Amino acid sequence: MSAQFLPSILVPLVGLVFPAVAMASMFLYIEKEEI
């Protein structure tokens, strides 16, 4: 298919980088104490 490299970069972004960052931000926000 075209851009054979692209899944190899996007999949780790959405299954590892984005989940870790989103979970860290969510856990910071639910404990933000003063929003």
Partner 1 sequence: MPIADYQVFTALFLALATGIFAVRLGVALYK
Partner 2 sequence: KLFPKFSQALAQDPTTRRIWFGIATAHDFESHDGMTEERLYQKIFASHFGQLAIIFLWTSGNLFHVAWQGNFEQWVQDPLHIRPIAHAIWDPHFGQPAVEAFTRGGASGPVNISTSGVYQWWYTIGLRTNQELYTGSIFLLVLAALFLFAGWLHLQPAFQPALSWFKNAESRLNHHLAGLFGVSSLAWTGHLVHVAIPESRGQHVGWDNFLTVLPHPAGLTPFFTGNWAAYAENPDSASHVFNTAQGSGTAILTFLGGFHPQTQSLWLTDMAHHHLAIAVIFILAGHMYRTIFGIGHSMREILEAQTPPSGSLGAGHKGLYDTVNNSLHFQLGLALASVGTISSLVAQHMYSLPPYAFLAQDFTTQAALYTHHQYIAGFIMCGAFAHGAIFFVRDYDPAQNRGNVLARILDHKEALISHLSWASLFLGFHTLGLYVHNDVVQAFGTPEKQILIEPVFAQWIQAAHGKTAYGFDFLLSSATSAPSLAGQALWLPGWLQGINSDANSLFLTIGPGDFLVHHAIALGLHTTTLILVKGALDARGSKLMPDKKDFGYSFPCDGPGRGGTCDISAWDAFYLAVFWMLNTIGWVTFYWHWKHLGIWQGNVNQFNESSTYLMGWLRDYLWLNSSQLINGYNPFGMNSLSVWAWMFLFGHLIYATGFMFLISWRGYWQELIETLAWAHERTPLANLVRWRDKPVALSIVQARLVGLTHFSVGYVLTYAAFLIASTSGKF
Q: Is 34 left (phi over 0), alpha (psi -120 to 50) or beta?
A: beta
> Least Å distance between CB 19 and ligand CLA?
9
Q: Is residue 25 within a helix (H) or strand (E), and if so which, with residue range?
A: helix 18-30
Q: 1 vs 30, which CB is nearer to partner 1? A: 1
Q: Which of 11, 13, 18, 19 binds partner 2 (CB under 8 A)?
A: 11
Q: 6 vs 16, which CB is nearer to partner 1? A: 6
CA separation for the pair 1, 12 (Å, rounded): 19
> Least Å distance between CB 10 and partner 1?
9
